[PDB]
Amino acid sequence: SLLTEVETYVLSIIPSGPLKAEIAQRLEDVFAGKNTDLEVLMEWLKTRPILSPLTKGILGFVFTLTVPSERGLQRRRFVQNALNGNGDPNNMDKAVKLYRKLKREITFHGAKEISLSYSAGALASCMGLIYNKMGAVTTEVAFGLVCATCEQIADSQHRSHRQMVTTTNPLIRHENRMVLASTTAKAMEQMAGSSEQAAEAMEVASQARQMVQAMRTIGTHPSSSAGLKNDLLENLQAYQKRMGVQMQRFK
Amino acid sequence: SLLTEVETYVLSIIPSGPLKAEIAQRLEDVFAGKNTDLEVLMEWLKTRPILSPLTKGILGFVFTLTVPSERGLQRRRFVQNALNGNGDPNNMDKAVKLYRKLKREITFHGAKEISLSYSAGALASCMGLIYNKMGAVTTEVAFGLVCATCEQIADSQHRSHRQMVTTTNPLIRHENRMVLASTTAKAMEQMAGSSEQAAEAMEVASQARQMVQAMRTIGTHPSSSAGLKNDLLENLQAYQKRMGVQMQRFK
Amino acid sequence: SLLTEVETYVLSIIPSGPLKAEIAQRLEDVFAGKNTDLEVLMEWLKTRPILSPLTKGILGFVFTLTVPSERGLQRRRFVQNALNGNGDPNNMDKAVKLYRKLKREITFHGAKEISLSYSAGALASCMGLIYNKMGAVTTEVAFGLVCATCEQIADSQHRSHRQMVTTTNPLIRHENRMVLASTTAKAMEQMAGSSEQAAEAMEVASQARQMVQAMRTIGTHPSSSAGLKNDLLENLQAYQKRMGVQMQRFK
Amino acid sequence: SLLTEVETYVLSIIPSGPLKAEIAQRLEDVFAGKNTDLEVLMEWLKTRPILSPLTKGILGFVFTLTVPSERGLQRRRFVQNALNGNGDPNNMDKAVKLYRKLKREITFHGAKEISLSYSAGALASCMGLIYNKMGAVTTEVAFGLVCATCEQIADSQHRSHRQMVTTTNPLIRHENRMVLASTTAKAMEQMAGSSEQAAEAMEVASQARQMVQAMRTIGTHPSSSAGLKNDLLENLQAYQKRMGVQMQRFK
């Protein structure tokens, strides 16, 4: 069940969207013996616009571990660029210290357990060593290094959400609502359901998007109005809930 | 009953799937005097895509112990690559220290009992020595070395599950559910029952797979919605239980 | 604003349904100078099947207070039957004691404030005296007597809900869910929306109604199954929430 | 919402089965203005074979309260026979004591709250007085008397289950399993699903019924065997769970 456990950590860091569905479907193919040619897979991976270079690096890295027949594959540049760890010497010293301990393990958990003791920076650098063949560790350990990195990123992915919503600055909190509404509105428009709900869903989605932009145009500063900041948010709250129920309707 | 005891440990580490059924059926043939030609067996073993190189190594290793007429067999490369223990000198020193003690035993249990006192890394390296003929120990001891390795991996296989499900990070926990549902959905589709339940089972399986991917597309981040994260998991929980009962229906 | 305050209390006791909308619309007509002929109004009131005789009595009583030109109206039998207070002598003694104090007031609040000090039984009897012309109090006081009765009933209407849901007997609690689901399912079917949602709403409503009756047929006793009582409620909970969101969709 | 609250209590006491679905559907018709002729309704009620005379009495009683136009209805004999309270003088004295207090209330909850302070015997007798017109209370109170009786029966319906399953006598506990299995098996056979599962469900149901009767034929006394009592129950436990999952399959 290692292939399932790694798939949890890897897919956690990827942002939600059509790519996440496409990436996960790709992971199943290469985790189920349906391995397509690596080059066309990675070439498709490279062109993806939304993924961050670091996140794009891990997905490229994980594919290489599955495909057999080394010495005939190709080490993609963007993976090396992403995983290089900024070329820092100080953190890369920790990476070697990690890689010393990883070489002695063969169990996936043993790699993950020791890896999480080190900073998120070192794992990216150390994970570069395995990809570049500078080091060499068994496949089970290498995933244990990926999950330690993916868990570290995934932890900060969640910790950022907790800090952003509980922020005390009112200005961004208002700004958080409009962009959040726009993103939720964007979610329906891009996913056009087969049923007639797509037309209705697009309308309500376009309604919020057409209205949120007007809300930004008026603004919500205390000095930009005389109490209009209050009622402006209220319509958004209704619109957010209006879009909230709309999601499960086509479900 | 040694052949049964080793078959327990060896088959424990292999991930569940069609290969596990095929591998175990192969083990019965070579553990019951139905030994097919080793080369065609190992050649089939090499091409298997899902098995990790280390796990693939042990299965290749165990077959060699059964087949008689050394000096006329062939030492497969992938076994040596997997069992080399990353070429570390430090852990391989422990392997020799182990191999010193294994040479003096002949009992299977005696090999297993002493072997488990050493790290999982050393056993992989020491188990390489027996395969490469660098060392030489009686067959009963050698299985005692395999089971010590297989037990060590099997222990970490279970310990990883305990740590993954009890993880405190909510983001992966949600991600754990979708991939878990996809895997369970994948289980029915690949195993097409002879009865008409295959069509119905495929439909409900495709229903979850068609719906889990939509769930990923919407996402479940706290900042990607306004409470939709709650009800999105609930339908999965019903779907998981819906697929849960469906398994024993064709049983 | 007396006509609004009385309309609150009167409409509170009436159960929700198409009649409540029809009754309230009627109250507006007779509270806004659009007074239709009393006889045709009360004749329509008499034929209503769902209203309890006591609740039907108050609505008949309130209309008589608005219409002018006494001695030419008609005292309907069902109002007298409902408001007679079971012909008890003991509670009717309290009613006279109340009616002694009401005669001295002219303010609506003064009537309501003193009236609530007496049991709900007496108010029904005392409210009979005003309708039958046995007594005679100014119109503002008489509404003050109605609201005291309507408030008393409305208080027990709510207090019953609190006691029913927090009941400790598991058997009725399970039974509460099925009937509650059936009522909610019945709500959509009777109110056929003009949009196409009526067809879809009817389907999901008929789904719960078609499934709740099957749930009753199987039953949910601990001795009628071996754990099926658990999962049977779960589908209802999903169905209840499924119908819950469906309500605001046509809104 | 009184009509819903009474429907909870009334339907709780009725045993599960096709009749319970039919009765509840009838209650909706007479609680929603679809009141069919009382006589044909009660005549159908009388012929029902499974309902106990007391339980059959309450359902007959509740219908009479809804239908208007007294003096032209008919007081059915079986209702009087069931509700007579065995003609005891002692408990009927309590019933009058209750009926003294009920006459002064008009609120449904007020009737229910005071009614539950009295023994279940008195309520049956007192509930007879209202039906026979010996007494006279408002409709809201009368339901408050029914629910007090229905709650009292429903409480003992549940309390019997708790005492039966936790019984220490092993002989009935074994006997409880066979009859419980037969009842569960009977549930599927009578409810023939429209899908093909009816044929399969009937087979497994007939399997348990065909096997439970054989189990009774062998018996399960300690002196009727030499350890066969153990394994005989085990197959039932599998059969019970086998039928347990089968229920939600056609759901």
Curated annotation (Swiss-Prot), chains A, B, C, D:
One Pfam entry name: Flu_M1
Residue ranges, annotated region (Membrane-binding): 1-163
Gene responsible for this protein: M
Residues forming coiled coils: none
Molecular functions (GO terms): RNA binding; structural constituent of virion
Subunit relationships: Homodimer and homomultimer. Interacts with NEP. Binds ribonucleocapsid by both interacting with genomic RNA and NP protein. May interact with HA and NA. Cannot bind NP without genomic RNA.
Organism for this UniProt entry: Influenza A virus (strain A/Puerto Rico/8/1934 H1N1)
Motif Nuclear localization signal per UniProt: ranges: 100-104
Region (RNP-binding): 164-251
Keywords: Host nucleus, Membrane, RNA-binding, Viral matrix protein, Virion
GO CC, any one term: virion membrane
Entry protein name: Matrix protein 1
